Each structure stands twice: as structure tokens, then as C-alpha cells.
Design a binder for this molecule. Sequence first.
Ligand SMILES: Nc1cccc(C(=O)O)c1
Length: 357
Amino acid sequence: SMKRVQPCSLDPATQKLITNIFSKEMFKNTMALMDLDVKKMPLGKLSKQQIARGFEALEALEEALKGPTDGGQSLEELSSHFYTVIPHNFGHSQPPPINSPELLQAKKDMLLVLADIELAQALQAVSEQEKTVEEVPHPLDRDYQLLKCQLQLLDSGAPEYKVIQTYLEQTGSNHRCPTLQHIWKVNQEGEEDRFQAHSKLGNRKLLWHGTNMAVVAAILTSGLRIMPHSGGRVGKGIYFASENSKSAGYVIGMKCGAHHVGYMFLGEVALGREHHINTDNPSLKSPPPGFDSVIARGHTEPDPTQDTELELDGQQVVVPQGQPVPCPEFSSSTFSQSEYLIYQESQCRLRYLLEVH
Ligand SMILES: Nc1cccc(C(=O)O)c1
């Protein structure tokens, strides 16, 4: 009647990772950090229906702002409906009206993180198979297995290790530099086949993508995604940076013991033919008709003369190794650092996960 729990197959670093990215405490923290009222909206009550209602409430708001003053509901009443469907906590004061584009997108981005938290919870549901088997995996093996994604810890003499480390150091912040703890090689399967469909596409680069810890299990499961309400300064696709310090800005870590722990991806991005912009355009949904990517060009760029290459599944993939240098032609760009954009999920492939302190 009592099921055997099998020993854990996972090395220490991977156990800690898998513990971190499925941690209930980490999830709640992320909710409290987004002003969500965890008491009225607990992890196990979190639902796809509810997130869906939240987005519609947001949609109603966007029509309100981006529309004119017809006879519709005020922003106050429409905000209030949103806050009924997605309960927020602001020390038991009335939450603020969502009454600017900035605020609207901030709330979309929140609901996108929460969706990925619900994804993790959904993923952890116990199947009926699992009730019937008389031995179970170690809980960390089960959780790793749920990702359907391969993770291989790199040690310091792996062929790519020094390349990645140099990428990190040279393009990370000079003073407040992220401390490298571990690198995992990442192979989500079936990501492989969408990516094979861009194989005659050249101009591949390994690019940073920072995220909060709460979406890391979602990304390892499903890839980086372009969701319906996602957006930003270069519109509706997947954001990457050649400067670690840029992507580090979007990492949301958690205090663990004496450390603040955070996670960072490197994606192989098939940029093909690049279209360079120098002003924000949040409406972009694809590159211009000849092009495969949009690069919002920064004041600086890792010194291309120091670029190296890495052979990934037989393809040349460029890895910058130089410190940022000025790019005279983009000195008046609205972008201090470059933002690399692709507008279809198939154009990127997860290659590495980094733990940094
Ligand atoms: N906006 C933006 C630009 C570049 C990288 C990132 C990131 O998520 O790492 C975000």
C-alpha cells in the first residue's frame, strides 16, 4: 500500500534548480512582487478561465484608452472590474486606475507571468497513472521529467564553457557583475524541428534573454513564446540582447540564504537579414517584408572584431566576446543598448541556462 520513492538521479546543482523553479514560495513571492493578493488568489485556485477573464477586462480597458469618449464605462469602473477578477493587494487601499498605455502593458505583462505560474501548477497535477504505479520517482526527478526538456550541467572544461563565461563577463556590468554559478546545456525536444525549418537562414547569434524565475519552468517546457498581449519597445516578438547587462535588468531573482539567485538563458537566434531601427516602435508585429529580424540598435555593441563562433548542431553561431564599444552610426538612437527581435517562435532555439549570483 505504501509507494516506494526511488533515489534521485539528479546532481546537486540540478536538484537546486528544479527546486527553485517549482518552489511554491518563489511563486507566491512573484505574486506579492506584482501586487497580487495571494490570500484571495492562491496557487492552487489559480485558473486558465480566470486569467482569460483578466485579459478580457484588460482588452475592455484598452478599447477605453485607445478609443474616444463615447458613452462607455469610465476607466475607474473598468479598472475596478479587472481588480475583482484579478485581486490585488495594496495594503488594503483602493488600487490605482489603469489609465495610461504604460500601466495597461504593465498589467498585461503581469497576467503573462501569472499564466506561466498557472502553467507550472497545471504541469504538476498528478495523473491517474501516477496514482496507480507502486513506485514513484524522487519528487525532483518527477518535476524535471515534467519539463520534457534535457538539461546537462557543464563543468569548467566543456568546449563552450570559456566562450560563455567570457560573453558573460565582457558584456556584463563592469562593477555589479553577475557571478556565474552554473551553466546547463538545454535541449527542449521538438523545438528542434521548428528550428530545422530555418536552416538555410544564416546570421545566427547566441543572445541573452533574462526573465523572472517564475517563468523559467514554462520556458523550459514550451520554449520562448510570443503571446497575444506581449509587447514592448520593439513590438510583438521575442526580446534578446547582445549585452548581458541589458538582459540582467529583466532577471527577477530571489533571496536565498546570503545570496540573490537568478536565471538567464542563451538562445541561438537565426537573425537572417536584419532591419535596423533607431526609434521605439511598440506596434511592430513582424520585420519589414524583405527581412527576418528587427534590431533596435544601441549606442553600443560588443566589439564585433572580438566576435567568435560556436558550432551548434553543425551550424556556425556567433558569440560576442568583446566589451561594449560605441557605434557612431547609432549614437542618437533611442536605445542605449541593442534589442534583438524575432517575430516568430521558430527562429530561436534554447541552448543554455545560467544560474548567476
Ligand atoms: N527588452 C529586452 C531587450 C533585450 C533583452 C531582453 C531580455 O528579456 O533579456 C529584454
